[PDB]
Subunit: 311 residues, 5 copies
């Protein structure tokens, strides 16, 4: 239990590898996911070397307390991960192969700008702090980095899991720290949002537009106000599935714009009635006649303009 000293003054390299067994619980509001994975570590501790011939074994086993093991920690987790050591195997030249299975709740932020058509890059950061008698550095053994074929992140498609090979070394409170960037890349499954949120929301909007083929204020006011309410619901529904971003989300813009198309419609519906009461069904009907086209056209127009600004 003290770090393997340098036959010189080289920094000690620890080889890391993560193999995801489960991803689950990608919580958008909290911006967390839960992982369940193999962590693999490898470094040379010459003090542990031995003879295959004399000792008679090709490889020797140790319990974690027996030998020095590098204090590797995750940077962006809620709590210290729950780890369970699975195997420590030393080879004759003093090469250690560490293997734990852990579970942690990771805290990587998401970009909601293109929601629900967004993609994310999840981050799991490995870090290790250098000790007083030598510098420890992390490196990625690509051979030991992966994920099993089952790994299903409910509601998301998993594109890739890779590590940035080059550690970011830097100084944190006196000693030096080595940080590795594992990257889980995912894209949201947009399908459900279509029949659940987007279409219904459009339907109630279209239903509102039939007031342009009506002359009854007593009824138009009921069409336009009733649906505006239904819209409010969908609005609230959506913003309870989402963290409060300081930027504007796509679904948020669309949802907000539609408020305008309701307010303008209530205006037109009111203007039209104001005329009819003053005996002007002529002016009214010419406005009402334009609305029937102006709305769907300015809508299908502005949506195009949003999509542009967003994709």
């Amino acid at each position: 239990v003290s770090p393997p000293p340098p036959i010189a003054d080289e920094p000690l390299t620890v080889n890391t590898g993560i193999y995801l067994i489960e991803c689950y619980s990608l919580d958008d509001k909290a911006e967390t996911f839960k992982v369940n994975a193999f962590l693999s570590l490898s470094w040379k501790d010459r003090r542990l070397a031995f003879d295959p011939v004399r000792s008679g074994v090709r490889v020797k086993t140790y319990e974690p307390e027996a030998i020095w093991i590098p204090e590797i920690r995750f940077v962006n987790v809620e709590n210290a991960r729950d780890a369970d050591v699975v195997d420590i195997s030393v080879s004759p030249d003093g090469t250690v192969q560490y293997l734990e299975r852990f579970s942690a709740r990771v805290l990587s932020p998401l970009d909601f700008r293109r929601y629900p058509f967004d993609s994310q890059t999840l981050h799991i950061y490995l870090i290790v702090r250098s000790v007083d008698t030598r510098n420890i550095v992390l490196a990625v053994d690509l051979e030991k980095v992966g994920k099993n074929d089952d790994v299903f992140l409910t509601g998301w498609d998993i594109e890739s899991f890779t590590a940035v090979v080059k550690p970011a070394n830097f100084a944190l409170e006196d000693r030096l720290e080595s940080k590795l960037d594992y990257q889980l890349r995912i894209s949201r499954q947009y399908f459900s949002y279509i029949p659940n949120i987007i279409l219904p929301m459009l339907f109630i909007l279209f239903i509102s537009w039939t007031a342009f083929w009506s002359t009854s204020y007593e009824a138009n006011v009921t069409l336009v106000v009733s649906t505006l309410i239904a819209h409010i619901a969908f609005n609230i529904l959506v913003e309870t599935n989402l963290p409060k971003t300081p930027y504007m989300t796509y679904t948020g813009a669309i949802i907000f714009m539609i408020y305008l198309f309701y307010f303008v419609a209530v205006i037109e519906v009111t203007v039209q009635h104001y005329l009819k009461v003053e005996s002007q069904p002529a002016r009214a009907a010419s406005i009402t006649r334009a609305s029937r086209i102006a709305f769907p056209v300015v809508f299908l127009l502005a949506n195009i303009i949003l999509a542009f600004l967003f994709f």
Copy 2:
């Protein structure tokens, strides 16, 4: 505490058995259930053999630290299960009988396509990793696999609990791994969904169709829009009890279709009024007269077509 070595080079076979004591908390959104069960392990460690005559006992007891026990783990769990060792009993020939009682939260995905008339196969996967001095293989002792008669999974009927006898062996990071597939088969209890969701949803739809026996736009608009709102509620209610699937669920299709039957009805209700205002109660009433049949018939028609595509 080191694996029983081979009188040859055979792999060491561990015999497994799971006996469910409780299933509970089948959470559809998270796609998890909680289990509370006996895990039973059995293998031969010849080093532990003894004489009944001399030693005077037909069977000897050991504490878990005393002997080597195979590191068996669950693949698809949230966290390492909580286990409590109940008994370790060694027989004269060096046969070990291990028995723990554990509880875990298992993570097996569900298929919602036929919801709420769906059936699921829950999976509990046992795995064991081979050590450096021999290969460990899992096997199923059917005699030790079952569930007690109480085991009640609230809201589900339990059909069966069996294991696939043949382990999937494969290589994971250097060493070989042996994985067993225990399978809990359940079918959802569809009853409640009938008076709680399905019928009410139909009733409000039928109530909407009485606008076809009315000439009052001021009222039809109130019938059709008011119920469309009630429908929206049921829609939201249902989609908060369900994970966001990238496929279409039965209840989801039915619920989405009904939106169309609301939008078409608002159209007809509007068309009819447009005629009456132009003085055409003739054309109107002939359309309105067809609707009274076309709707219920196209509905009862399309539902049949869905059920088909789904079952």
Copy 3:
């Protein structure tokens, strides 16, 4: 730490007693409650006997590790209970008095058929597994079974706490198991449901029936549809306080029936208007006149019939 051997071949009897200190968190959806209680155990381990005269003490103390203690476990709990040993007292003849204070979350199912006028029998099952060198059997020391006068289960009245004196012995995976049935009997406090759910729900229904003293379709449709909506709310409110039962609950029937009385009312309201438009205020008014009596009488009739089927 090995079981007291038989001066013969009798099974070892352990005397149990549970004394509830707290019940709390009766969760209807989950069908669990949380308990906080004394567990008391007593058995004879002759090896522990001693002389009062020589040893000078009337009774001797031991720490749990010092002596063999029977592995007693709860059958229907979420996780192994949290226990804290309070006292172990051995008397001269080798009689042990064990006493722990534990807390567990128990998993006993409820019957909702008569909800909210229902009563439940909660179950806490003690179990013990026989060891290889003798059979262990549980028994109830009634003197040590009870609950303190405070024990308040929020929202429920506690009728009784008793144990079934006769253990169910049976064989589970090789060895024999002894199971005791402690029974907590409770009845739901129905009062609040009256002003919170039941009356309001009736009031909105009665408010709907004033359409029978009206000839205005434009208004009846608003009365009947608006209240049907309010009803839907109460329906949803109630079914979020309740697990999804595969049987029909009382409140559920009542709530479902009322849907019918809304659908029929919308029919009558429509029929009446259809006549009036065809110039038939005569036929209309004779129907409308009957409704004013038929409804309240068929309602008060059918409710009686439900109560019957249910109580």
Copy 4:
């Protein structure tokens, strides 16, 4: 580790003191709060006495395992409190000063009758069980009982924290138990309920009363039914912030009464229309004219009568 024996046969007195550092999470539905406090214990164990002169120290330190410490426990907590021993200090005459810092979730019931103008007395009960070789009794060292000035119970005003000096001694399962009653006295902060619940609820009610200055059934029905719905919302909102009491709460009565004033109003609104249709605007208008006064006066009357029965 065995209790200090009596130089006679006196019971051993343990002096207790609680000093709250944090109160937080007063959960009305669960009737729990969370505490974070100093527990202080003091008793005489003569075996521990020593000489200041020879030993050279005015006071000696011990680790909890070194000496016997009385098993003090909380009666009304969810789980055994988390404790962290801060200090054990023995004085020459064998006087022990124990000090832990703990946190627990306490389970004291609340009285909602005057909600939200209610006050509560929270209870923390210390208990200790007598051992076989002498009787232990609790007492309150007032000097060591208090709370820091910060202690802020979000949404409540803290009036006082005191202990009932006289322990309740009694026999529980063979041995004698000593129980102390610490009492945290709080009064609810009623302010927010005013602009959030009470006034809005009144406003929508007043808005409903403008139907008394209207002759339009088509509109009155919309005023009265629409607001009755808004009221239902506030009702539901309030009863989800509150446990289900078997008695009647103030806010509950007020909220329930208002249902009546809606049902009567719908009646009057209907009666008035019934007359007008029979050509009787005379009778109608005389009723409608009374309502304009009868309602506000019978309301402001009945509220006074409730407040009376409740305060």
Copy 5:
């Protein structure tokens, strides 16, 4: 394991430093956030001093049990923090450098008066209790106080993290206590509240004001009551995101005021109809004509007055 004694009678100074790694879960209702940080401690324990020349090391390592470490605790946390010791490094003069990584849930109250345009000062209080053989005092090593550049508090902007250098010393139950005030300063990200809550709420209000350009009571009542309902929703939405303050929040005032502008509008809408029925379209229309200006002007007026009182 006993405190370093004074070469005199000076108090022992412990140097503290906190370096935030994660902030997350700022829960407004509970008034808590979760922290994940380095705690750094440093003090002189001369008993530990040694010779670099003889001993051959520039610095020596110890496990936490080996040496005396000051019992530093957080004042305002839910539970004793989870700590993991990262390093203990002793320098020849007996200077100790302690370093743990901890996570706690902190309990600092927020000021909602200017919500959602508010700023907060979060507090993390370190405390240490003096022992019987000397006084311990805390101090801030500024060099060891900070936060990494990632630290993202979802929905908030982080302005600063600093410590008040001067400890508050005071007496708590016999001994002296030293308390340090670490201060995390944050300002809320108000943006989202604009399109999500504030504008929608204004739009529905404006939509209500179109009743001033209408003469139809049957319709005005529907406009004004329908939107009052939508407003109620937003009100409820907002007050479920917020603790119940005994003071008035900005959003709360605005939301409450708007109720008045609904009640007055319903009055005017009623007054206008009352006149029209008495044949007075003259008086009506002069009132209605003023409203069209009075409302928007008294609104835009009063809002200015609130903003003033609040900022």
